[PDB]
């Protein structure tokens, strides 16, 4: 996260770290959506241009974390993966369309003050809140600058951007399964996701029921925190039917 700040303790209890077993390193962010399901970006697991194709046994999920590198004894919980599910129409060839994946844990995780699931938005909450100018919140342990790495989880609040401005900021083909967020050059304020924040959540706190909803997944950007560029997020609600199909069938 570029131009963010340290998270408060328990501020993002759905935050998940995807951790590579060997070599031990941060792979991506993710989010906890129930006691046994974790949501992330497909490109965190499968990206052939970079020779990336992880299987279940390559990875662990670490939940309840705050420090990036410490083993947070008696706080974090580490889970193994039963199965990975990648969207069947995830477009790794072109533009990361449908950049979404689910991971089922081998055993349910116990909730605590530090470990708690986020809601996924219904049609009406999504319609009300996914509007240009409305702000969401992005969290992660990724890089602090495009060109270092944080001691603890970082957080930044960013406004959703009008779709024509998103489209006009890039040569990559945008789709309805994406939205973009960030400040414009004339707005003064700054902030963005960056390498390592992939797969983490873009959340909004509904003013109707005072609950947090995950509207987006950190997906792609061109550099980090560049003027006139914006971060792109998988549109979670648009992929609801696939999420529900996977969880209803497997779970």
């Amino acid at each position: 996260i570029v131009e963010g700040s340290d998270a408060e303790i328990g501020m993002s209890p759905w935050q998940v770290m995807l951790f590579r077993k060997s070599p031990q390193e941060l792979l991506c962010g993710a989010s906890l959506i129930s006691d046994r399901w974790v949501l992330t970006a497909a490109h965190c697991l499968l990206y052939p241009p970079w020779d990336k194709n992880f299987t279940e046994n390559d990875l662990l999920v670490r939940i309840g974390k705050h420090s990036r590198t410490r083993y947070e004894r008696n706080i974090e919980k580490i889970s193994m993966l039963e199965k990975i599910y990648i969207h069947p129409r995830y477009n790794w060839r072109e533009n990361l369309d449908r950049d979404i994946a689910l991971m089922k844990l081998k055993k349910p995780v116990a909730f605590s003050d530090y470990i708690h699931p986020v809601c996924l938005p219904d049609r009406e909450t999504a319609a009300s809140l996914l509007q240009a100018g409305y702000k969401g919140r992005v969290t992660g342990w990724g890089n602090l600058k495009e060109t270092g790495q944080p001691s603890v989880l970082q957080v930044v609040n960013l406004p959703i951007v009008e779709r024509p401005v998103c489209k006009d900021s890039t040569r990559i083909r945008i789709t309805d399964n994406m939205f973009c967020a960030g400040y414009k050059p004339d707005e003064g304020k700054r902030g963005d996701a960056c390498e390592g924040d992939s797969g983490g959540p873009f959340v909004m706190k509904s003013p109707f029921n005072n609950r947090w909803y995950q509207m987006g997944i950190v997906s792609w950007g061109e550099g980090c925190d560049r003027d006139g560029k914006y971060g792109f997020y998988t549109h979670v609600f648009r992929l609801k039917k696939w999420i529900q199909k996977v969880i209803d069938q497997f779970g």
Partner: peptide
């Protein structure tokens, strides 16, 4: 750069 995690998880 990361602290070792318990062997039970590997």
């Amino acid at each position: 750069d990361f602290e070792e995690i318990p062997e039970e998880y590997l």
